Structure formats: structure tokens, C-alpha cells
Design a protein around this ligand. Structure first.
Ligand code: BKO
Length: 704
């Protein structure tokens, strides 16, 4: 009983290694044409009234806003005599950066992104203080685009400098210790627009050096690899200022080349392409800089260590036969990151069965000294420099918005103190609980899953479930706080489940590789098995399951609705990759071939064609679940044509179906992108639309 927008079908046949593949909506890849704009408008004119017709939408939006309305803080970061921290009074579109002269002083606004946009669509993206804390560089992004403009302020005064760096994307921000400028990345000029609405591929990223007090036209090109247009040049200046550490990436795997420049031995100031020394000249493993003491550099690596470890490489004797293990790989836990504090101490953060743990190690020996106690959850913030004597860290969990701890590092015992508690106002979290289960996938592998629910729940199959997954790119889905999840559990009888399917990083690089490239189908099998587990154990029934994922998790949703429409009642795919044959042709999509392969390869095509959601829509005996696609017109990470073409093809497939009664809809936002930096107002509206769609499609019941 739904009438879907018209969408012209333009037969386009292409040959993939002998296999003919036909598509009909390639015209939707042009975001600027009147035809595409009319399609977008028509889809919004269908979905918006449907979402706005939810009879509980006002209560739902009000409750999400009320739960969300609590003051928020980042860890305080020391920079000289001042601490800097982000603050949100509760519902501001963007958090404000405050400065205070000591932890006990009156704070003052240092940088307010809300003052830069009337709707909060300008966000920070990357920040870096100079080594003397007298200058502050920061990136600004508009309308959610990955494109960045780097600007500069005096610190702590916050006075603006004129320096403005354009065409920045995926950028380093590394000050030299002479305080004269910084290294950053940018792309040379390109055909067409560069505002986040274009689909143009980004290649040949350059490393530049900008001198404070000059126009960007004077910036020096310091590194480029034109014979490797997909290489991306990470730049960091060593803790002593002497070395530029160059970490070169190609694609999204946790591996990099490792080169360096001796800046103090240069016979001239930074003037042109720098002469570097190669330490690691391959992509076999990760080398992530932690710290250095003179020429001895400490790196996190996965070299022969899928769960990660720390090694020492001395630049004075850099052959691999001289490298030394500093911290052994753990038998079971993934080392997520390490930081050096108070000259010779290390904070190591591990993931053990999808929960974070913190330990203090000595830098000289690598030996473990202490554990910093935590509840079950995630460490989402950290501050603590080698030159300072205390750390702060922020903890979050499903029922805990935040706890900030402070720990003095000057003695041989470590007794963290609670610095701040961030709680929802007037909400009894003790009515709810989280369980961790391990369910068998098709091949026998046990997969972790968190289930958040009201205490006293009985397993009668009656509860609506929100089942979330991602499954890729070495990303672990660890506990975190969601205000809308609380509203779902409190007022909509909901059960929230997160399946830690393969492709993520939860158990290290073997977990990641078990869910990428030719093994990508394992991810979808794992997620389908999660739904089967919830049904079999009578948490829910298929008709009451909503699946949700974003980005690579939107691919997860698209593949799962094609493969097992019978397992789900509703599906919400945000900013999803859905044309798996062409993803690599747009913006930064070429970087994802390390998880997906590429249709340019015969072997990879045989894998991709089996699951590419755009190419696998088929009516089954069971109807497809209700579907809501969400994207933004400035999502230049995953270009919105993915959602647009999938929507056109799915609506066409079921145009004349008697059995398809669930709606298949899309909402295309304006002035927003992939998600980072999206203003609070848009986030709350999106969450309201998501749960409104579920209410209207799987029969949720609101209880006051
Ligand atoms: O978004 C994604 C994936 C998932 C996750 O891997 C990130 N990612 C990207 O594509 C990020 C774009 C490539 O960036 C890099 C490439 C190589 C090495 C480093 C970087 C990032 C440095 C940087 C970035 C920003 C600021 C400063 C520095 N997907 C969408 C659909 S599935 C994949």
C-alpha cells in the first residue's frame, strides 16, 4: 500500500571478467543532476510523513532529549600552566573547549564551534598544541564532510592567527619543536567541487609543512609518492623533537611502512622534499610510535603477534636482527594502545573478552607494575604526557555515561581517584543489567554478544530486540553509553543486543581476517547466528527483531536482509556501503579493498558478486523486513549513491509484489555527512526517526 517514487531505469551492461552485470540507476551517482535531486526529494517526501506519523514521536523525542540532557566533560589535558577540556552543558550542538589555569581555577571559553554555525554544522576535526603550549592548531569541517580547514590560535588567549590551510583531508598535525610550523596532509587541486557532495576519488595525498606567519601558498611539499597514489603519509615529530616519524599506509589494514627523517642533522631548514631513512620497507606489520629515548624507539606492533606487543627499534642499529621485544604479546588479550607518562612509565590498555583493562608498565624493562581497576566497560579518553606526572582517563559503559579518573604517576603504587562522575539525571539504572553470552556461529566459532535489558526479564519470546553489528576493519564494538538505548529499554520494552562478529578487532588480527576479503561471508553468518540465538533462547521472535548497523555495518544490514529476510522484522542501515562492485571508484573507497577486495580482480569479483547488496535483491517466500536507509548529502566517506541506488532497485523489485507489505524507505539529510561531528540536534532527530520507524513497523508499545 506504499507508492514509491518514480526512478528511470537506464540499462547499463558492463563486463566483469566475462560476467555480464546490468545496472539501471547509475545516473544516481551524479549528485548534482536535477534527476538525482528529484529522486532524493521524492524519497524524503515519502519517508518524512511516515516517520512524523508515529503517534509517540513527540514523547520519544522528548524522552531522548531529557535523558541526553546532562553535563558532559572530556578528560582535562595539561598544556603548561593550563588544563584544557571539552564541555557540553547538556544539549549544545557541539562541545566547547575550555581552558583553566590549574584544576581549581575559573575556566573560560577557548574555542566554541557553535559560534561558527547557526545550526551547529561546523565541527572540530583534529587538534594539536605546539610543544611550548603557546599555539593551537585545529581542523574545522563543514556539513559533516571529511574535508578540513586547519586554523590556528594563540594559547591560552585564544586569539586567532590568520593562518588558514585548505584542501586538508585525513591529515597529520605535527608541530616541530622550534614552534615554527607543522606537518599536515593535503590534496592538490582537482576537477569539480571539493565540499563533500562530490564523489571524486582522493589519491596522491601529499605531506606539506606550513610555517606560522606565512600564506599557505608558501607551504613546502616535504613528501610524496606519485608511483604509489594510494599511499598516505602519516607524520609525527618524536618526543625529543629530533625525528620526523613517517608511518605510510595503503588501505585500512593495521600495517604500515616506517621511515624517518633526522631533522636536527639537516643542513637546511625545511625547504623541500625531505631525505628519509627506511626502517620498514613493506606492509607486513603495524609499527605505531609510542615514545623514544634518544635513538631507541618504542613501537606497538602486530609482527608475528596477532594480539599485539611492544618492541624497541634503535635507529642507530635498525636492522631487524637488533629489534627487541619490550612487552610480550598476551596469550588472550589484545593490546589496544600504549602511552608513555612521567618519563619512564607506560599505560597499556588491553581488550579482554570485549572489556577494557589498564596496566602500568616500566619503560626500561617492559615489566608490569600494577593494574588500574575498572568496572566492566570501555576506556574512551586518556590524557598523560611523558613530561607530566599524572594521567586522566575516561570510562564508559552501557549504564554509565562516564567516569573520569585521575592517577598520580610519581610513586611505585597507583591509586586512581574518581575525578568526575557523569550520570543521567533522575534515571534509576539499577533496574537494568547487561549480560555477556557466547553463541555458536555456523562454523562452530563462539561469538561474544552483550545483551542489555530490564532486570527480571522472562524468556517468553515477546521482547522487541535492537540487534547491532559492524563486523570489519579491525574495529571492536565495546561497551558505551547511549541515551536512546535507555529510552528503548525503559519505555519501549526493548532488549538491546550487540554481536561482536568477526571482522572486528575483538580477538586480534585473526578475528579481523576471519571476517574480511574471501571470508567476508563469515561476518554475515555470525550476525544471522546472533539473531537465531536470540530467537532460540526466547529473548524475542524474528518479527520483533530490528537489525541496525552503520557504514560497513550498513553493508551488514543490506546483506542480511537479502540472505535471511525471514529472520528480521525491521532493518535500519545508516550510511551504508551497498554497491560492492563500485565502492572503490569514489572518494576514499579505494582504501577499503584491504577488507573487501576489489571487483577489478577476477578472484575478488567472484566473492563480491555473491553478497553485494545492490546486486542480490530477490523476492523470497518470506517478505523483506521493513527497511530505513539513512544518509546525508555530504557523506563523502561513503558516497550517498550507495543508499540511493539500493533504494531505487529494492523499491522496483517489490513494486508489484502482493506479499511485500513492509515499507522500504530512505531519509537523506542535508548539511550532514558520515557522522563524525554531527550536531546534537540532528543526532536526536535521527534517533527519534529510527525508533519511530521501529514503532511503526514492528509494533512497539510505549509505556510512560
Ligand atoms: O570509514 C571507513 C574506514 C573504517 C576505518 O578503517 C576508517 N575508514 C576510512 O575509510 C578512513 C579513510 C582512510 O584513512 C586512513 C587510511 C589509512 C591510514 C589511516 C587513515 C586515517 C588517518 C586520518 C584520518 C582522519 C583524520 C586524521 C588522520 N569505511 C567506510 C565504509 S567501510 C570502511
Amino acid at each position: 500500500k506504499f507508492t514509491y517514487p518514480n526512478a528511470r531505469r537506464d540499462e547499463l551492461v558492463e563486463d566483469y571478467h566475462g560476467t555480464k552485470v546490468t545496472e539501471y540507476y547509475r545516473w544516481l551517482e551524479d549528485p548534482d543532476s536535477e534527476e538525482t535531486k528529484a529522486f532524493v526529494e521524492a524519497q524524503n517526501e515519502l519517508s518524512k510523513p511516515f516517520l512524523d506519523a508515529c503517534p509517540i514521536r513527540e514523547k520519544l523525542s522528548s524522552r531522548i532529549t531529557e535523558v541526553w540532557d546532562y553535563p558532559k566533560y572530556s578528560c582535562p589535558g595539561r598544556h603548561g600552566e593550563y588544563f584544557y577540556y571539552y564541555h557540553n552543558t547538556g544539549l549544545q550542538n557541539q562541545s566547547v573547549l575550555y581552558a583553566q589555569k590549574g584544576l581549581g581555577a575559573d575556566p573560560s571559553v577557548f574555542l566554541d564551534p557553535n559560534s561558527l554555525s547557526e545550526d551547529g554544522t561546523v565541527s572540530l576535526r583534529g587538534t594539536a598544541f605546539s610543544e611550548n603550549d603557546q599555539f593551537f592548531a585545529y581542523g574545522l569541517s563543514k556539513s559533516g564532510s571529511d574535508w578540513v580547514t586547519i586554523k590556528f590560535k594563540k594559547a591560552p588567549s585564544g586569539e586567532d592567527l590568520p593562518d588558514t590551510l585548505e584542501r586538508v583531508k585525513f591529515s597529520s598535525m605535527a608541530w616541530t619543536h622550534d614552534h615554527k610550523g607543522l606537518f599536515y596532509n593535503r590534496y592538490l587541486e582537482q576537477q569539480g567541487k571539493s565540499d563533500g557532495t562530490e564523489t571524486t576519488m582522493n589519491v596522491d595525498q601529499k605531506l606539506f609543512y606550513h610555517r606560522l606567519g606565512t600564506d599557505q601558498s608558501e607551504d613546502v611539499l616535504v613528501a610524496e609518492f606519485p608511483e604509489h597514489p594510494r599511499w598516505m603519509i602519516g607524520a609525527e615529530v618524536s618526543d625529543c623533537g629530533r625525528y620526523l616519524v613517517m608511518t605510510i599506509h595503503e588501505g585500512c589494514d593495521p600495517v604500515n611502512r616506517l621511515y624517518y627523517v633526522d631533522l636536527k642533522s639537516m643542513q637546511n631548514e625545511i625547504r623541500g622534499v625531505l631525505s628519509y631513512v627506511k626502517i620498514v620497507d613493506n606492509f607486513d606489520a603495524e609499527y605505531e610510535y609510542i615514545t623514544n629515548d634518544g635513538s631507541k624507539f618504542t613501537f606497538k606492533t602486530n609482527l608475528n603477534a596477532s594480539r599485539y606487543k611492544l618492541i624497541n627499534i634503535d635507529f642507530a642499529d635498525p636492522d631487524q636482527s637488533n629489534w627487541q621485544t619490550l612487552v610480550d604479546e598476551d596469550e588472550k588479550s589484545v593490546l589496544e594502545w600504549a602511552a608513555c607518562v612521567n618519563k619512564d612509565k607506560l599505560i597499556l590498555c588491553y581488550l579482554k573478552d570485549v572489556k577494557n583493562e589498564l596496566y602500568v608498565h616500566g619503560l626500561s624493562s617492559g615489566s608490569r607494575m600494577s593494574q588500574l581497576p575498572l568496572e566492566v566497560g570501555s576506556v574512551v579518553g586518556y590524557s598523560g604526557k611523558k613530561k607530566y606526572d599524572e594521567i586522566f582517563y575516561q570510562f564508559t559503559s552501557f549504564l554509565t555515561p562516564g567516569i573520569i579518573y585521575r592517577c598520580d604517576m610519581t610513586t611505585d603504587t597507583y591509586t586512581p581517584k574518581t575525578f568526575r562522575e557523569i550520570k543521567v539525571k533522575d534515571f534509576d539504572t539499577s533496574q537494568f543489567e547487561t549480560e555477556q553470552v557466547f553463541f555458536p556461529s555456523k562454523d562452530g566459532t563462539k561469538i561474544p554478544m552483550f545483551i542489555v535489558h530490564r532486570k527480571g526479564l522472562v524468556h517468553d519470546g515477546s521482547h522487541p530486540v535492537m540487534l547491532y553489528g559492524y563486523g570489519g576493519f579491525n574495529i571492536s564494538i565495546t561497551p558505551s553509553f547511549s541515551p536512546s538505548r535507555l529510552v528503548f529499554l525503559q519505555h519501549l520494552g526493548g532488549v538491546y543486543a550487540i554481536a561482536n562478529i568477526r571482522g572486528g578487532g575483538e580477538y586480534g588480527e585473526s578475528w579481523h581476517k576471519a571476517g574480511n576479503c574471501a571470508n567476508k561471508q563469515n561476518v554475515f553468518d555470525d550476525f544471522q547466528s546472533a539473531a537465531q540465538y536470540l530467537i532460540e533462547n526466547k529473548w524475542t521472535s524474528a518479527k520483533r527483531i530490528t537489525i541496525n548497523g552503520g557504514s560497513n555495518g550498513g553493508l551488514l544490514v543490506g546483506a542480511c536482509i537479502n540472505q535471511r529476510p525471514d529472520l528480521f522484522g525491521c532493518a535500519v542501515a545508516q550510511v551504508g556501503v551497498l554497491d560492492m562492485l563500485r565502492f572503490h571508484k569514489f572518494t576514499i573507497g579505494h582504501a577499503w579493498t584491504t577488507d573487501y577486495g576489489s571487483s577489478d580482480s577476477t578472484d575478488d569479483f567472484k566473492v563480491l558478486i555473491k553478497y553485494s547488496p545492490l546486486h542480490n535483491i530477490r523476492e523470497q517466500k518470506d517478505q523483506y523486513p521493513a527497511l530505513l536507509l539513512l544518509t546525508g548529502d555530504h557523506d563523502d566517506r561513503v558516497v550517498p549513491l550507495h543508499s540511493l541506488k539500493f533504494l531505487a532497485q529494492i523499491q522496483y523489485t517489490f513494486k508489484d509484489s502482493d506479499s511485500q507489505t513492509n515499507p522500504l524507505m530512505g531519509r537523506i539529510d542535508t548539511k550532514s555527512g558520515h557522522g563524525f561531528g554531527k550536531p546534537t540536534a540532528k543526532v536526536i532527530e535521527e534517533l527519534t526517526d529510527i525508533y519511530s520507524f521501529m514503532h511503526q513497523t514492528v509494533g512497539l508499545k510505549w509505556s510512560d
